[PDB]
Amino acid sequence: DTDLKLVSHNVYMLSTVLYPNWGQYKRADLIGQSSYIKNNDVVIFNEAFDNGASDKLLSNVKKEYPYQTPVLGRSQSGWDKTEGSYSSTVAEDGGVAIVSKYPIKEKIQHVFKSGCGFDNDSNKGFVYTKIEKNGKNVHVIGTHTQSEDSRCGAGHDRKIRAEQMKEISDFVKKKNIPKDETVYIGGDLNVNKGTPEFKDMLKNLNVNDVLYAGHNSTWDPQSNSIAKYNYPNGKPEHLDYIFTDKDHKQPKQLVNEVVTEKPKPWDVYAAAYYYVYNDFSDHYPIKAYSK
Numbered sequence: 486d487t488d489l490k491l492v493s494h495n496v497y498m499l500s501t502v503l504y505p506n507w508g509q510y511k512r513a514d515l516i517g518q519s520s521y522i523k524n525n526d527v528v529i530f531n532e533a534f535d536n537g538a539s540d541k542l543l544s545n546v547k548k549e550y551p552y553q554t555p556v557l558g559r560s561q562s563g564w565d566k567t568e569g570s571y572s573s574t575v576a577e578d579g580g581v582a583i584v585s586k587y588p589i590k591e592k593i594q595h596v597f598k599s600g601c602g603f604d605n606d607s608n609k610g611f612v613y614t615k616i617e618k619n620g621k622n623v624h625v626i627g628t629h630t631q632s633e634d635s636r637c638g639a640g641h642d643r644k645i646r647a648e649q650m651k652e653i654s655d656f657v658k659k660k661n662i663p664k665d666e667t668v669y670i671g672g673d674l675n676v677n678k679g680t681p682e683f684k685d686m687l688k689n690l691n692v693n694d695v696l697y698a699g700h701n702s703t704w705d706p707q708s709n710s711i712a713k714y715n716y717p718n719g720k721p722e723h724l725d726y727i728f729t730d731k732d733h734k735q736p737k738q739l740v741n742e743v744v745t746e747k748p749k750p751w752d753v754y755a756a757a758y759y760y761v762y763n764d765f766s767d768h769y770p771i772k773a774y775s776k
């Protein structure tokens with residue numbers, strides 16, 4: 486009715502200056518040609534860091550999703566409001582963008598005030614959109630929260646995520662969005678399913694849990710060729726979600742499906758080594774919808 490089909494995907498579009506050989510441009514095209522990216526209402530991207538590769542990706546999906554936000558933290562242009570700890574002086578944007586098949590009526594970027602000082606060179610945060618479907622409004626917040634960084638510390642990473650999630654939920658409450666409109670909150674939330682922290686996330690984001698489908702992890706060194714390479718030893722975890730605020734209208738029966746679609750194999754002929762991969766990113770995308 487106003488309920489949406491969404492995808493969220495951390496696309497691993499690292500800086501092509503710092504990480505020249507991660508197939509960023511090749512993957513921007515493959516993602517655009519994929520099936521999972523198609524036939525949704527709204528797509529949330531995370532780790533759209535490299536400006537050129539990210540803009541290519543966004544361009545690759547513009548015909549289907551003509552209404553697009555800028556990428557979080559790139560500049561103040563194109564936003565209805567910029568808030569949080571927005572910095573001109575950070576070399577890296579926040580990598581979050583939202584595209585929509587339906588007109589975006591309002592777009593706000595919020596760079597997180599909470600974070601870690603020895604990788605604070607990112608405008609990480611959330612992007613809020615109000616979207617009009619069938620003359621009615623629906624709200625989508627896309628985000629990407631503090632990674633499990635071995636330098637900041639596990640305990641600190643968890644506290645950072647808590648505060649960042651509270652920034653989102655505070656934003657939602659202060660926005661005074663009428664309770665008869667749904668507010669989706671999704672992205673790479675970096676909290677593993679089935680953990681003590683997971684219960685905290687539901688409270689801090691003010692969301693209900695969802696029904697799950699498909700694969701049982703979203704970052705999976707056992708089946709994903711990119712994750713496998715980077716962290717051969719890694720435990721698969723389920724880190725990407727799309728939830729709705731629990732005090733606003735609920736979808737009929739929200740599902741999060743972890744999609745394991747793979748592109749045709751693609752290579753990087755680095756001077757040092759040759760490598761072949763067959764994933765869009767080191768994370769799998771989530772598709773959310775109600776059946």
Ligand SMILES: [Mg+2]
Nearest residue numbers: 495497532767
């Ligand atoms: Mg990552």
